[PDB]
Amino acid sequence: MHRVMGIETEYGISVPHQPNANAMAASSQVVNAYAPANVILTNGARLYVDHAHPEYSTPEVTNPRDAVLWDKAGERIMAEAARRAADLPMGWTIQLYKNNTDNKGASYGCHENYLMNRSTPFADIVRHLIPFFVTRQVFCGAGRVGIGADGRGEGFQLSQRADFFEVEVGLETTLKRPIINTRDEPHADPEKYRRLHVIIGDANMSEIATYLKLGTTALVLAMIEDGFLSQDFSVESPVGALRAVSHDPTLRYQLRLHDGRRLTAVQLQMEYLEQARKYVEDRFGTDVDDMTRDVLDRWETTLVRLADDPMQLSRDLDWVAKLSILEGYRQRENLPWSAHKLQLVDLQYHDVRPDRGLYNRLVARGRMNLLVDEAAVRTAMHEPPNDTRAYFRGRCLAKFGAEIAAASWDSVIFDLPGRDSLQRVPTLEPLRGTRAHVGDLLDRCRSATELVAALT
């Protein structure tokens, strides 16, 4: 399975016993702590401050597995960053959570970037993506305690982000959040590529969840690009449908389509799945790779299980695991959904600390299914993907970092001693600057000036 993709995660940030502490200052403190506020790492990742939150952007990857890997590495980087920020002259102890809300009314996003054909019409993209994004929370949702934006309403829901979206298609602003964001900033050749920026997803702890989130979406995008979907999945009141699907963890809520049909979110998801299998069969036949197969099978199995029983998926999915823990607390202490302790558990599930994280403690108990090894995660902290331009960027920062003036997805800007102007090396193509392309060359060059010379 090949599509250029990435994940940008804004982490929840809290400084205990520090009412005066500023979110911007704390975020920048976290970023500057791991710095040894915008920095680029040797794994191709970016670490910065966005919307007053510490944010980790994975390097460009070609598959959901790698995405999961470098994202998970992002978590470790965040934890380490906070731990280091605690040791700086200002002793602020910073707690980071990978989640979408503080249940005080604040919302912060987890972005998914996909590269698509420029030739693909935006109308088709919207038309076929809307029902998908509305209903995908069934396996995607990380779960939330409390209903509504203020979280004052008593109950548990599938999606943290759902109550914060008021519109179908538009630009992301502080005032309104669209289901489909129209801002296009490819950082790739504009005629060749369009960048799909998806802000509706919850940050997922579970590797399976992130895997499905990225993978199934990649499949749907592939279908959209080939104009494979004849069917119209269009939903009346898609935003209300989003809220309503979120607010029914029993998964029995039916939403109304434009053709009149009533089906649940899981059912519409099954429609997308069968469409995906039909597509992949027709297109790739026998040559179909293991990862596409795995994503399809996991998608199907997850849906079927969700229909049969949600709670058997507790090892696979975030909201089901969290719900399991929460219901544990509820049976034990006789707590209604409005108990503060429940919201505290909800929050602590996303804590990036190894000992204090509930997802992490579940993993330590072997109670969560994992796609990748921790060794690969550790490696993915300091080292870039081989098949994208993040390889070139990362290895340049590692080897030539002393001579690097600046770095971005678009370019690497070198300071060549003895030269007036900074030497700007453009990386426009995400599929170039790979290990196959520049690997040997980077091995050869003893100097950044040598490298720049060889590239011209």
What one-character-per-residue DSSP string does 241-259 give? HHHHHHT-TT---EEEBSS
β-pair type (110-117, 5-10): antiparallel
Please name every residue paired with 115 in a beta bridge, in sequence order, or none if there are none.
195
From 8, 12, 176, select the one nearest 103 (Cα to Cα).
12
Considering only CA atoms, give the Rg of the chain: 22
User: Dihedral of the CA atoms 269, 275, 277, 283 (nearest 10)?
Assistant: -150
CA 188 – CA 291 distance, rounded (Å)? 25
CB-count exposure of residue 153 (10 Å: 0-12, 13-18, 19+): middle
Packing angle of the helix pair 238-246, 122-135 (nearest 10 deg)? 20
Residue 11, domain member (yes or no):
no
β-pair type (167-170, 178-181): parallel
Residue in the structure block whose two tokens are 């040559």: 287
Question: Which residues 6+ apart lie within 8 Å of 374 measured at CB?
Answer: none
Q: What one-character DSSP code corresponds to residue 171?
A: -
Please identify every residue annotated as catalytic. Answer: 50
Backbone angles phi, psi at 23, to 5 degrees: -60, -40
CB-count exposure of residue 252 (10 Å: 0-12, 13-18, 19+): exposed
Q: In Å, how far from its chain's centre is CA 153?
A: 27
From 140, 178, 281, select the one nearest 222 (Cα to Cα).
281
Residue in the structure block whose two tokens are 């919850």: 202
> Residue 290: how many CB atoms within 10 A of its CB?
8
Q: Is 211 labelled a binding residue?
A: no
Residue 43, domain member (yes or no):
yes
Residue in the structure block whose two tokens are 């001579």: 403
From 64, 155, 50, 65, select the one nearest 108 (Cα to Cα).
50
CA 446 – CA 456 distance, rounded (Å)? 16
CA 50 – CA 48 distance, rounded (Å)? 7
- Side-chain half-sphere of 253: how many Cα atoms within 13 Å? 20
Q: Is 204 labelled a binding residue?
A: no
CA 128 – CA 224 distance, rounded (Å)? 7
Q: Is 99 labelled a binding residue?
A: no
Q: Is 437 labelled a binding residue?
A: no
CA 289 – CA 285 distance, rounded (Å)? 10
Residue 10, domain member (yes or no):
no
Q: Are 268 and 233 in contact (CB under 8 A)?
A: yes
Q: In Å, how far from its chain's centre is CA 450?
A: 37
Residue in the structure block whose two tokens are 């300091």: 382
* Alpha helix ranges (H) inside 289-357: 290-308, 318-333, 340-348
Method used to determine the 3D structure: X-ray
β-pair type (193-198, 46-50): unpaired
Residue 398, domain member (yes or no):
yes
CA 372 – CA 360 distance, rounded (Å)? 14
β-pair type (46-50, 38-40): antiparallel
From 183, 180, 152, 187, select the one nearest 166 (Cα to Cα).
180
- Side-chain half-sphere of 199: how many Cα atoms within 13 Å? 24
Q: Is 55 labelled a binding residue?
A: yes
Q: Is 197 labelled a binding residue?
A: yes
> Residue 254: how many CB atoms within 10 A of its CB?
16
Q: Are 395 and 354 in contact (CB under 8 A)?
A: no
Backbone angles phi, psi at 14, to 5 degrees: -145, 135
User: Dihedral of the CA atoms 274, 256, 246, 53 (nearest 10)?
Assistant: 80
Please name the amino acid found at residue 440: D
Residue 5, domain member (yes or no):
no
Cα angle: 260, vertex 261, 262; to 5 degrees:
120
Please name the amino acid found at residue 30: V
From 57, 12, 147, 91, select the one nearest 409 (Cα to Cα).
57
Packing angle of the helix pair 207-225, 265-284 (nearest 10 deg)? 60
Largest Cα–Cα distance in the chain? 73
Residue 7, domain member (yes or no):
no
From 97, 111, 85, 87, select the one nearest 30 (Cα to Cα).
85
Q: What one-character DSSP code corresponds to residue 181?
A: E
3-state secondary structure 114-144: EEEECCCCHHHHHHHHHHHHHHCHHHHCCCE
Cα angle: 66, vertex 71, 77; to 5 degrees:
130
3 state SS of 10: strand
Report in angstroms the alpha-carbon separations of 177 from 12, 194, 199, 443. Answer: 18, 20, 8, 46
Residue 2, domain member (yes or no):
no
Q: Is 195 labelled a binding residue?
A: yes
Backbone angles phi, psi at 61, to 5 degrees: -130, 160
Q: Is 8 labelled a binding residue?
A: yes
Packing angle of the helix pair 318-333, 340-348 (nearest 10 deg)? 150
CA 89 – CA 437 distance, rounded (Å)? 44
Range of 47's domain?
18-456
Residue in the structure block whose two tokens are 């403190």: 29
Backbone angles phi, psi at 321, to 5 degrees: -65, -50
What is the per-residue burial (b if ≥16 Cβ within 10 Å, else e) of 79-118? bebbbbbeeeeeebebbbbbbbbbbeeebbbbbbbbbbee
β-pair type (46-50, 53-57): antiparallel
3 state SS of 195: strand
Q: Is 340 labelled a binding residue?
A: no
* Alpha helix ranges (H) inside 171-247: 207-225, 238-246
From 45, 184, 51, select the one nearest 120 (Cα to Cα).
184
Stated resolution in angstroms: 2.6
What is the per-residue burial (b if ≥16 Cβ within 10 Å, else e) of 324-354? bbbeeebeeeebebebeebbebbbbbbbbee
Q: In Å, how far from its chain's centre is CA 60?
A: 12
N-to-C CA span, the chain: 33
Residue 4, domain member (yes or no):
no
Report in angstroms the alpha-carbon separations of 360 from 64, 159, 322. Answer: 21, 20, 12
Counted domains in the chain: 1
Please name every residue paired with 264 in a beta bridge, in sequence order, or none if there are none.
254
